[PDB]
Amino acid sequence: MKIAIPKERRPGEDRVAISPEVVKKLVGLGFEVIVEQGAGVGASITDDALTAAGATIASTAAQALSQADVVWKVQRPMTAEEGTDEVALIKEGAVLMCHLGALTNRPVVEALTKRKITAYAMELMPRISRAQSMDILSSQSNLAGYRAVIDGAYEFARAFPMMMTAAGTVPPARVLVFGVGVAGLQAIATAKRLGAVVMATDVRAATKEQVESLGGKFITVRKKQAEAVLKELVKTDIAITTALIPGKPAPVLITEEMVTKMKPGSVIIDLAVEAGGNCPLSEPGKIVVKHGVKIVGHTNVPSRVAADASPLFAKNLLNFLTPHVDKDTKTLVMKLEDETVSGTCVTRDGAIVHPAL
Amino acid sequence: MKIAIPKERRPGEDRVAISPEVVKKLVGLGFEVIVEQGAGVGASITDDALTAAGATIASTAAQALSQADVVWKVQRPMTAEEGTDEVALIKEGAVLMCHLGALTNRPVVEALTKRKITAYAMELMPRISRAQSMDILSSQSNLAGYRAVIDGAYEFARAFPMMMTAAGTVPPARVLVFGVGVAGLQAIATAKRLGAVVMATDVRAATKEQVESLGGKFITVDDETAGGYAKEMGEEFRKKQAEAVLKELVKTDIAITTALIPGKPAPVLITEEMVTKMKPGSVIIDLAVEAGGNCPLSEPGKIVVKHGVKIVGHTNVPSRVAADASPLFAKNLLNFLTPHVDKDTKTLVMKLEDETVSGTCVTRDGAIVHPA
Ligand SMILES: NC(=O)C1=CN([C@@H]2O[C@H](COP(=O)(O)OP(=O)(O)OC[C@H]3O[C@@H](n4cnc5c(N)ncnc54)[C@H](O)[C@@H]3O)[C@@H](O)[C@H]2O)C=CC1
């Protein structure tokens, strides 16, 4: 059975749904792994690294997908509606696993249905302990949190750590995190090891135990809490906002007003800029300089860590798929009763199985 | 007594030779401090912050250095030939303190002489324990080593620390620091903060203890350097070092080169041949790029990609951390000047017997002192 991985065509996407380690396991299961040439370059994965692991390199995506029984991608395929029709390249009746937007994209689903393609929307993965190893949202958000801090320190004109030197001492950077989700947690851990003083906040107080767990200071003041956040913000150096609730615009945690009171040289990294942004001043894909403050709004953050994001994404897919491989008959048999299968399947045999729109 | 600090005008310089804390110290010493308007913007220091510290703001740099008895700058003033004649703005007989690049910028030196200005090239500061607090090279390089790691992490498409997630374990980054001077030391400490596995190498055996004390491993090449600083090393060594460094360079993800040799061009530590055997996606941060570079592929002010490796050669790295580099620079100047402000009588008399004075002063009252 053939499994193909094409190069991500959507501008800005540099991750790839494969890694040499996974290629070895796929071949081990009985698959022939085909990868579009140049697919992993963005992720520091050369065509030679992949062929050394057991993969065959195909030129162009049409070639790679022409006879693939299984297709893995990072972002959902493009439709003729967006130009290049990637769905028409997938064999009819083939299996697709990738972040399908699922919730918000109708045309891709309609397109998949017309070709009788069974598509599993990895991002819809049931939130059960046993499926944590197949959860892409988590793996990518973890790296996204780490990178928020890195980009924060790169844009900051001060050093994160407190440095006591012959020439005086460098005070530590003060980092404030809005959103103690998976990403928020890594932003806290990363800002901590760099030596910053880390404050965290979230409307969900159940996180209070974890913020303190990593060394952060939960901000406790319930709306008189807003004054408790303006209090910390006014003396904050790096504000990292990760309030992204998949399937809904992002909350406005920092108004242009809260920003005009911040200090020059301060930095705001809005990880939720795609969904509007926790800060209305952030502009998708740019760094705005307002009131002396830099508002960072990079688009594909996990792609900024593509070389680590890719191997993890590839293992989430392998974890989700391995339980269903026969190998002895070299065929895929997705157990319909499996909760990870029925929950992520958005279209099968020409029928839309999931209601979202 | 008036001390003035103008805005740095050279390309890309965001630092400023002042800070509110230091404006406070100066005023207490009996000084009238004047800072040119917007001189600390690139350093995140507002005119308001300097005013609250007790400083006066002058609309123009000309106005600020007009009556100034002492002038503090980050980089050497520009000559009439360079467009803006800053030397001309300096009051004749005044004292100037800054990184003069004297040894390689004679025109600015003799230009200062023609105005009988007394200049102390802070970069020449004697290499001695009691000077550590007045040494700009150290304060600036220490921040540059930290920055090299931030710029390194920024260009790297992988995470520095080992990540243990539900999707699996991702090993930590492997860092190799070439030249464990002030910059290399902070690079190691900062690389270790982010959780990387750190390797390091230097020609000075004294550095082996410092590297291991930070959790890093030293790469010994031979064993069998100078009066503080390093010398131009031999080829038997130079070729044996490369051979021993390559054993590790092939696993290295981030290589930070900080090797410098007083006078001579920076030593080449990573050849193109060596870069060709590194892992795709690796990053080389060349901090000696301005002195020639430790990697022949580095290009000043650019990020080059050769053989799948990113060669980063940013200029004026201290300015990349300008908001912390400036208050330290200002403190180096303050610590250098303080011992000379007479108290029994109150004026500025630089005692010439002072090693930090005889060594930094390159010109005094129309006469040049030690250009050879
Ligand atoms: N006030 C004081 O006492 C000062 C003391 N120092 C001391 O000086 C030493 C280093 O001085 P830095 O300012 O960092 O000067 P630097 O920038 O010249 O140091 C470069 C580093 O690269 C090394 N290096 C040179 N050529 C090399 C080659 N071919 N291969 C491998 N490594 C090479 C040197 O040994 C040195 O550690 C430390 O011991 C430091 O504490 C430095 C400044 C002031």
Q: Going by C-beta distance under 8 Å and a sequence separation of 6 or more, which residues neighbour residue A231?
A: none
Q: Which chain B residues have a beta carbon less than 8 Å from that of A160?
A: 150
Residue B89 DSSP one-character state: G
A13/B contact by beta carbon, under 8 A: no
Q: What are phi and psi of A324, to 5 degrees?
A: -105, 10
Q: Going by C-beta distance under 8 Å and a sequence separation of 6 or more, which residues neighbour residue A19?
A: A40, A45, A310, A311, A314, A315
Fold of domain A2-143+305-350: Rossmann fold (3.40.50)
Kindly report the CATH class assigned to B144-320. alpha beta
Q: Does ligand 1 come within 6 angstroms of the Cβ of B203? A: yes
Asked whether the beta carbons of A160 and A172 are under 8 A apart, the reply is yes
- Residue B310 exposure: Cα atoms within 13 Å on the Cβ side: 20
Kindly determine whether residue B167 and residue A194, on different chains, have CB atoms separated by under 8 Å.
Answer: no
| The two three-digit tokens of residue B170, written as one number | 């991702």
CA B145 to chain centre: 9
Residue A202, annotated as binding a ligand:
yes
| The two three-digit tokens of residue B307, written as one number | 């053989």
| The two three-digit tokens of residue B195, written as one number | 């959780």
Residue type, B275: V
State the method: X-ray
Kindly determine whether residue B163 and residue A311, on different chains, have CB atoms separated by under 8 Å.
Answer: no
| CA-nearest residue, atom 4 of ligand 1 | B127
Residue of A307, A338, A332, A303 lying closest to A318 (CA atoms): A332
CA B2 to chain centre: 27
| The two three-digit tokens of residue B322, written as one number | 């300008």
Residues of B involved in catalysis: 127, 132, 135, 138, 229
Do the domains spanning A2-143+305-350 and A144-304 agree at the CATH topology level?
yes
**Best residue of A308, A313, A318, A319 to probe chain B, by most B CBs closer than 10 Å:** A308
- For chains A and B, CB pairs below 8 A equal 137
Neighbours of B12 (CB within 10 A): 12
Q: The domain B2-143+321-366: what is its CATH number? A: 3.40.50.720
**Could you say which architecture CATH assigns to the domain A144-304?**
3-Layer(aba) Sandwich (3.40)
Q: What are phi and psi of A153, to 5 degrees?
A: -65, -35
The full set of domain ranges for chain A reads: 2-143+305-350, 144-304
| CA-nearest residue, atom 10 of ligand 1 | B181
Kindly determine whether residue B138 and residue A166, on different chains, have CB atoms separated by under 8 Å.
Answer: yes
Residue A223 DSSP one-character state: G
In this structure, which long-range contacts are made by residues B299-303, counting pairs with CB atoms below 8 Å and at least 24 apart in sequence? B303/B155
B224-242 per-residue burial string, b: 16 or more CB within 10 A, e: under 16: eeeeeebeebeeeebeebb
- Give the chain B residue nearest A150 (alpha carbons): B154
Asked whether the beta carbons of B330 and B39 are under 8 A apart, the reply is no
| The two three-digit tokens of residue B77, written as one number | 């003033």
Residue of B333, B329, B330, B327 lying closest to B350 (CA atoms): B333
B residues 40-99 closer than 8 Å to A (CB):
41-44, 46
Residue A203, annotated as binding a ligand:
yes
Asked whether the beta carbons of B297 and B311 are under 8 A apart, the reply is yes
Residue of A304, A315, A269, A271 lying closest to A288 (CA atoms): A269
